[PDB]
Amino acid sequence: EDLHDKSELTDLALANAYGQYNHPFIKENIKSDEISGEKDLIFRNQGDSGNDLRVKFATADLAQKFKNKNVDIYGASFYYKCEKISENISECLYGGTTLNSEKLAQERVIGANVWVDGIQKETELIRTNKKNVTLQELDIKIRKILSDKYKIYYKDSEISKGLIEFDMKTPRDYSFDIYDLKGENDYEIDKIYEDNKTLKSDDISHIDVNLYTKK
C-alpha cells in the first residue's frame, strides 16, 4: 500500500492529528493497581489538571505486566470517547508505558535524516534517557519536529505525502505513513500504539524521513 496523500483526509482528521502530536501526555514515576475492562490501567487524578488517566492496551497481559509497577508514561492523549472511570474528567491514552527504574547512564541522542522531494534538508535530533523507549514516544517526537518545521498537518502546506523509517541495528525496522490515519478521531488515530511496542535504546541506529510535494 503506497503512501497516502494528505488531500484524502478530512479537515477534522488533520486538526486531530496536529492536536495529538503537539500535546502528548508526559509523566514520570507513577503507579496503578487498577485494571479496567481487563485491558486498561487507571491512574486516578494523575492526568492533565487532575483528570483521571486511562492507559489502554491491546491485551490483558500487557496491563498485568505494568499493574502495580512504577512506570513512565509518554503518549498521545485524547478526551473524546475516553471512557469515564469516575465522575471526574477522564483522559485517555494508548500504551506509551515503560518502567521508571530502567534508565540509561547517559542520554541517548538519535539523529534523523530528512529529505523533501529527495532534497536533503537539515538533520534532526531527538533524545531519551530511557533504556527501553516506546516507538510511540519517538514517533511523537519526530512528527512534532515535522509539524513545527514542515507543517505536515496544516491543510494548506506543500507537504502532501510523508514516511518515517526507524533504522535499527538489530534485524527489525519500523515505518510510519504520516497520512495513513486510521480514522478521523483521536481514539481511532492513536489506536496504532496499543501494542505498546518498545525498542531497546542502544539498538536504535537512526531515523529517516521522506516527505513529498505535489511537484
Epitope: 477534522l12 486538526a15 503537539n22 473524546y80 507543517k151 483521536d186
Partner: T-cell receptor, first 109, second 113 residues
C-alpha cells in the same frame, strides 16, 4: 473563518447557572475564552486544544466540542463579579486569532 | 513583573488628522497585535508583527499603518483615509511558550467633526 457567539446579551440573577456558546462551521485547533471589563484589556480565562476537552476553573466549566467546531462556557452559581464581556477566540494550526462578537453577561446581586 | 502599556488613555482629534496610538511591552515577546473594538463587534485584528522589523496586514488594515523598529514598541497610526476612526483600540503581545495573548489597557479614540 467565522466564529459566532450565542447569546449576545444575558441578564441573570445571582445563584443561577448559565451557559454561553461559541460556534463555527470551520474546525479550530485551539479555542480560547477571554473576559473583559469595560474599557479594559481582555484577560485570558482558558485555552482548549483537543476535541471533547473539559476544563474546570472554580465555578467555570469550559468544553471543546468533540468535532472541534464549538465551545461552551458554563457558570455555576453565578455571582455579580462574573459580570463582563465574554469573548471567544479561535486560532487554526497556522495563522492567528479570530474573535467572536462576545456575550455580554450581567449578573444581578 | 513585565507588562503591556498604551498611551494616551484618551485621544481626541479633529477629522482629517492622522494620529498615533502608542503600545509598549517589556514582557520580551516577539509577537504584537492591534485590534479595534466596536459596540457589538468584538475585536477585529488590524495589524500584527511576529518579530522586530516585520509586520503584516490583518483582516481590516485599510486606513491603518504600523511600524515595528524595536521589539518593545508597536505604534499604530490611524490615517485620515480610515473612514470610521472612533473606536476603542487594543494592543496585545504573545510568546511561543503559551497560546495566551496578553492585552494592554486600551486607548479610547474619539474623532470630532
Amino acid at each position: 473563518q467565522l466564529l459566532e457567539q450565542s447569546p449576545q446579551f444575558l441578564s441573570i440573577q445571582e445563584g443561577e447557572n448559565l451557559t454561553v456558546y461559541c460556534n463555527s462551521s470551520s474546525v479550530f485547533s485551539s479555542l480560547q475564552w477571554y473576559r473583559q471589563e469595560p474599557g479594559e484589556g481582555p484577560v485570558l480565562l482558558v485555552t482548549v486544544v483537543t476535541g471533547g476537552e473539559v476544563k474546570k476553573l472554580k465555578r467555570l466549566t469550559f468544553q471543546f466540542g468533540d468535532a472541534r467546531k464549538d465551545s461552551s462556557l458554563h457558570i455555576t452559581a453565578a455571582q455579580p463579579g462574573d459580570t463582563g464581556l465574554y469573548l471567544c477566540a479561535g486560532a487554526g494550526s497556522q495563522g492567528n486569532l479570530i474573535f467572536g462578537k462576545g456575550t455580554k453577561l450581567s449578573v444581578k446581586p | 513583573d513585565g507588562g503591556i502599556t498604551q498611551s494616551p488613555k484618551y485621544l481626541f482629534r479633529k477629522e482629517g488628522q492622522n494620529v498615533t496610538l502608542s503600545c509598549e511591552q517589556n514582557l520580551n515577546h516577539d509577537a504584537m497585535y492591534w485590534y479595534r473594538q466596536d459596540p457589538g463587534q468584538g475585536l477585529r485584528l488590524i495589524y500584527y508583527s511576529q518579530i522586530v522589523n516585520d509586520f503584516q496586514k490583518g483582516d481590516i488594515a485599510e486606513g491603518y499603518s504600523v511600524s515595528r523598529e524595536k521589539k518593545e514598541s508597536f505604534p499604530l497610526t490611524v490615517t485620515s483615509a480610515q473612514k470610521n476612526p472612533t473606536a476603542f483600540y487594543l494592543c496585545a503581545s504573545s510568546s511561543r511558550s503559551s497560546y495566551e495573548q496578553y492585552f494592554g489597557p486600551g486607548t479610547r479614540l474619539t474623532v470630532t467633526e
